[PDB]
Amino acid sequence: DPSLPERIDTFTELFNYQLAEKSYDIRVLQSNYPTKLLSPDSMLPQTADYPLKDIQQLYQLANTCRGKLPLSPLITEPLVFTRAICKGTQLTPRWFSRSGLIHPGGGSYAARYVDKYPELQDKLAQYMHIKERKNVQGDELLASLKSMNDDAINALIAGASMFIEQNELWLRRGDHYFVFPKSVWQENVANAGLSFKLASQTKSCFVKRGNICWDVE
């Protein structure tokens, strides 16, 4: 009687990938969304790189436009950003495409810049975190990315073999993810002799694939 890994393999071979209703090319995904613009952590204070003390001094240097900051190779880029805002220095779109994109206090440089200069919205939207971006008519990938919860988008960022997005199942095949609705995948789970729970629902995830904890029927 097949092992759990074997059934998962049997499970993915039940899908007709030519008939998937939605599919995305991972190369196109990477070229248009740098990982830092997808990571949920990017919206949070960047305490993995800067002490929370430095981040609060940056806000004070921002809010007052006076004040010194400790020096370091990395903080040089946020310092340029902060002073440019105070000095009224024009930062071009090229500057954002060449930057590390994420401000030390969480969020993107672009979103913060557009906050001061709201007319630059359309030029700098592509350098903003997806959580800072409005949905645009006919940008379904951005719509799909924005609707994912942390566990789902982190499985995407990890390039996981599969993951569940609400009621849709994302399956990786070559350079693409193929998206299938529950009306297709639920029966496939049963016909393969499987069951599953999400990583956030159970405490026991011994056979993990993306955000999915597989088990037998």
CA 141, 128, 96, 137: dihedral to nearest 10 degrees? 50
- Rounded CA-CA distance 141/19 in Å is 18
- Beta strand 212-216 with 176-181: parallel, antiparallel or unpaired? unpaired
Experimental method: X-ray
Collapsing DSSP states into helix, strand and coil, what is residue 24? strand
Element (H, E) at 22: strand 22-25
CA dist., res. 181 & res. 166, Å (int)? 10
Q: Six-digit token pair at 165?
A: 């997005």
Concatenating the DSSP letter of every residue in 121-188 gives HHHHGGGS-GGGSPP-TT-HHHHHHHH--HHHHHHHHTT-SEEEETTEEEEEETTEEEEEEHHHHHHH
Residue 19 class from Cβ within 10 Å (0-12 exposed, 13-18 middle, 19+ buried)? exposed
Q: Can you tell me the distance from the alpha carbon of 129 to that of 36, in angstroms, rounded to the nearest whole number? A: 8
> Phi and psi dihedrals of 188, rounded to 5?
-65, -35
CA distances to 49, 69, 78, 160 from 57, rounded to whole Å, are 15, 7, 12, 38
Residue labelled with tokens 């193929």: 178
Taking the mean position of all CA atoms in its chain, how far away is CA 202?
Answer: 23
User: Cβ(120)–Cβ(114) under 8 Å?
Assistant: yes
Closest residue by Cα to residue 188 from 14, 18, 21, 9:
14
Q: Are 32 and 48 in contact (CB under 8 A)?
A: no
Question: Can you give the resolution of this entry in Å?
Answer: 2.2
